[PDB]
């Protein structure tokens, strides 16, 4: 069966504590990215579309590593995010890159699509469309 997605507990951009296993019972779209990464930014508008879809049986979570490998500090990131026109996308602060390491992230953007019991259903390097994601989740429990 699917390998367990490594658990994490991270602070979000808006100050919430977010723990992956608290989402058991719901599917999860998990995206690792960075503000300096062009293909990452390219993918954000479509992810905002997806977030606006009301009938989702999955939650969207994205993860950056502030102050690490060129990423903005937590002091500067939220302002930068809003000034790009980005909205309605959760961003978690992987302060010690520990989550990136646990997911063996060696390239970005990378998406992990996780089923309702916390198992990894799909790993995608680079781009994945909304229809691609929706199709993958339709085959997961």
Numbering used by the authors: 45 to 185
Quote the study's own text:
This study discovers the unique molecular architecture of two surface-exposed thioredoxin-systems, Etrx1 and Etrx2 and their redox partners CcdA1, CcdA2 and SpMsrAB2 as important pneumococcal extracellular reducing systems essential for pneumococcal pathogenesis and oxidative stress resistance. Surface-exposed Etrx1 and Etrx2 deliver electrons to the SpMsrAB2 protein for the reduction of MsrA2 (by Etrx1 or Etrx2) and MsrB2 (by Etrx2) domains.
Attempts to obtain the reduced form of Etrx2 by co-crystallization with β-mercaptoethanol resulted in a new oxidized structure in which Etrx2 forms a complex with a 2-hydroxyethyl disulfide (HED) molecule. Etrx2 has an unprecedented hydrophobic cavity close to the active site. The presence of a hydrophobic patch near the active site has been associated with substrate recognition in other TDORs. The CXXC motif (81CGPC84) defines the active site. Many thioredoxin-like proteins share also a proline residue within the CXXC motif. The Etrx2 binding site presents a hydrophobic character while Etrx1 presents a highly basic character in this region.
